[PDB]
């Protein structure tokens, strides 16, 4: 079969349930902290310590 016949490649299952929703929720946390850092250094800023 290694020369004559052929096959088909789908190649991406990735269906690991808890791992999937870990990916999604971790990404949501990322976008949270990203926009936080952005408007953090963007707008009027007051701190918790001095100069953070």
């Amino acid at each position: 079969x290694x020369x004559x016949x052929x096959x088909x490649x789908x190649x991406x299952x990735x269906x690991x349930y808890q791992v999937l929703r870990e990916k999604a929720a971790s990404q949501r946390r990322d976008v949270e902290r990203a926009l936080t850092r952005f408007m953090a250094k963007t707008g009027e800023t007051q701190s918790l310590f001095k100069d953070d």
Binding site: Y17, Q18, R21, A25, S26, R28, R29
Partner: protein, 400 residues
């Protein structure tokens, strides 16, 4: 609110009485004037005024039929709406001032009972009554039979209320109710239960309807009693102090037909104990259809008692198993995440529980590290618009 405020402060009194003629007659001048005036009082005072207003109308339920209350109020509003909406009957019009005296008169016209004692107790002696109804145990194979003493004295803010009655649950039997007296150095009996013996055979001789329960777990050699109560319908303004066997408290938490009883055994077992059976019965209470806020204070019971589990860490890191065994989204492989609403038992319960989990501390550095990281993970796994319910307060109490 009422007990806390009138033990902070003096009474909240409902005068008919003046200090007319530049007279005071104000023991309740612990801060300020009240008699003729709105604008002396505190919002603490005015709030508790309304609260005593609720509960004294409950006492008027306690002496008089609700149907008669409908009768009274219909007569009130009949006379008022009659006296309204006319050509101003001259000199004959102020029937819409329907104040205390003639109202009382109309009550007694509907049913004249001894409610002027009710007045001079509660309307006209602004005092909260604690209760040292001291549990004794006769028919502990005792010659004397099912007896408990009545006791009270605690000044600063005290009051002595005598003739009332007492509500007791037997094993599987009668709601025993027993009179009270003044001159309160008293000893009293119970309308005795049967010889509840061979109770392996007497499994359920009709506890309360078709309720189903079996434990010989209590001190059941000679305990034909289950629960003490004075006035479960909460007649007298009360703060009741007594002691039972802890078995009886926990078994009341196995079931009772009063939220009153359930949260007060919640408080009584928040004080002292730590068996793991306490933890067990607590969790058992948390997992049924019983009540919402019962379970919230039950969470705080677990908080106190697992804080008493420092050297006695016998149970697990608590309540993680409760999020395990009560919460399956898609069987929840080790973490509960998504869309857990529309069942508002679970709404309040998920809203409450991780706070009491964040209380769980044992003295090394009080070390709730697993709980810490777990709660951070809870904050991770929040829902999209699949929840139609604005995932808001859940965030708020995870933050708290």
């Amino acid at each position: 609110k009422i007990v806390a405020y009138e033990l902070k402060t003096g009474g909240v009194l409902l005068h008919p009485i003046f200090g007319g003629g530049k007279e005071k007659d104000n023991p309740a001048s612990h801060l300020h004037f009240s008699i003729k005036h709105p604008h002396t009082l505190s919002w603490e005072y005015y709030s508790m005024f309304q609260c005593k207003a609720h509960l004294v109308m409950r006492l008027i339920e306690n002496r008089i039929s609700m149907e008669f209350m409908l009768q009274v109020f219909n007569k009130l509003l009949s006379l008022a709406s009659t006296a309204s909406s006319q050509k101003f009957q001259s000199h004959m019009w102020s029937q819409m001032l329907v104040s205390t005296s003639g109202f009382l008169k109309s009550i007694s016209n509907v049913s004249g009972k001894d409610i002027q004692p009710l007045i001079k107790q509660w309307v006209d002696q602004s005092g909260v009554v604690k209760f040292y109804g001291s549990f004794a145990f006769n028919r502990k194979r005792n010659v004397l039979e099912l007896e408990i003493k009545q006791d009270y004295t605690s000044p600063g803010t005290q009051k002595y209320v005598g003739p009332l009655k007492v509500t007791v649950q037997e094993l599987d039997g009668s709601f025993n109710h027993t009179l009270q007296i003044e001159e309160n150095s008293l000893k009293h009996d119970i309308p005795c239960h049967s010889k509840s013996r061979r109770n392996k055979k007497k499994k359920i001789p009709l506890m309360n309807g078709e309720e189903v329960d079996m434990d010989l777990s209590a001190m059941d050699a000679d305990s034909p009693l289950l629960w003490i109560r004075i006035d479960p319908d909460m007649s007298v303004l009360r703060k009741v102090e007594f002691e039972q066997a802890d078995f009886m408290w926990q078994y009341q938490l196995r079931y009772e037909r009063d939220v009153v009883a359930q949260q007060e055994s919640i408080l009584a077992l928040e004080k002292f104990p730590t068996p793991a059976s306490r933890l067990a019965l607590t969790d058992i209470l948390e997992q049924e259809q019983c009540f919402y806020r019962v379970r919230m204070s039950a969470c705080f019971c677990l908080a106190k008692i697992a804080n008493s589990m420092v050297s006695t860490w016998t149970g697990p890191p608590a309540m993680k198993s409760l999020f395990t065994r009560m919460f399956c989204c898609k069987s929840c492989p080790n973490i509960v995440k998504t869309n857990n609403f529309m069942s508002f038992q679970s709404y309040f319960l998920q809203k409450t529980m991780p706070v009491a989990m964040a209380l769980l501390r044992d003295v090394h550095n009080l070390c709730p590290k697993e709980v810490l990281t777990f709660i951070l993970d809870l904050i991770k796994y929040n829902d999209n618009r699949k929840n139609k319910f604005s995932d808001n307060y859940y965030r708020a109490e995870m933050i708290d």
